[PDB]
Amino acid sequence: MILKRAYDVTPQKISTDKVRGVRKRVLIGLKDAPNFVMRLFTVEPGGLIDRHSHPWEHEIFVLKGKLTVLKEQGEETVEEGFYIFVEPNEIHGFRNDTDSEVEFLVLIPKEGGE
Amino acid sequence: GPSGMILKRAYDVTPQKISTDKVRGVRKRVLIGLKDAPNFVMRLFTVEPGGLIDRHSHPWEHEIFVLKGKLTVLKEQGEETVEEGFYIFVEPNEIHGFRNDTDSEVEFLVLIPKEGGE
Ligand SMILES: [Fe+3]
Ligand SMILES: [Fe+3]
User: Fold this and answer.
1) Which residues of A touch B92 (CB under 8 A)?
2) Which residues of B are annotated as a binding site?
3) Most CB atoms within 10 A, among A14, A103, B1, B32?
4) Would you call A2 an interface residue with chain B, using a CB distance cutoff of 8 Å?
């Protein structure tokens, strides 16, 4: 059994053509998990995960702040205490328009989970 | 399967009592359930003050994230308390349980492969 403070997992900064101002923690990876993985994303003020899609779903829980969710068209803001279910293949992305860090949990099946 | 995205306040789901021979003082909200999940389900558990999920095991894993309060985790040997911001991975077949020794509600997300139900 693994019991750990998520913050203590070292985050990985991401800065690419599609993702900026984001870091990622792998909490439960496929080293441990047989079916699905658990990650925690932190999005700095102005950070962006641009629209994309996958062959797999996302299950998300918003832990902190106000998260802007990019949809195929348009966008919707949600806050801490929301969950999000992204069907396979659905276009999605994220932005933080606020002045503080936004955090959300993201779980994906193992095929996405490397 | 279907397209789209569901975005919902978790508290818009009513917390239902869990009532079994091994659980007392616990409620659950099904967030992403069997009707929708391709692979795994997401529930939000609320442990009332003094609530208890006795030690048990099952042939599927748990992935847990603690949202609120101080959660006592029962292990095969002994126990450990964690708090908001901790995650827990429980291997298939590993003995585990939970207790709330505090005065206030403890909440945690619990995800399992959908073969284990909701
Ligand atoms: Fe994605
Ligand atoms: Fe269990």
Assistant:
1) 34
2) 56, 58, 62, 94, 96
3) B32
4) yes
CA distances from B85 to A105, A109, B16, B43, B67 (A): 11, 22, 24, 17, 6
B64: contact with A, CB 8 A cutoff: no
Phi (first) and psi of residue A94, to 5 degrees: -145, 150
Measured between CB atoms, does B22 come within 8 Å of chain A?
Answer: no
Instruction: Name the residue of chain A whose CA is nearest to B97's CA.
Output: A1
**What is the fold, at CATH topology level, of the domain defined by A11-43+59-78+103-114?**
Jelly Rolls (2.60.120)
Kindly list the domain boundaries of chain A, sorted by start residue.
11-43+59-78+103-114
Resolution of this model in Å is: 1.1
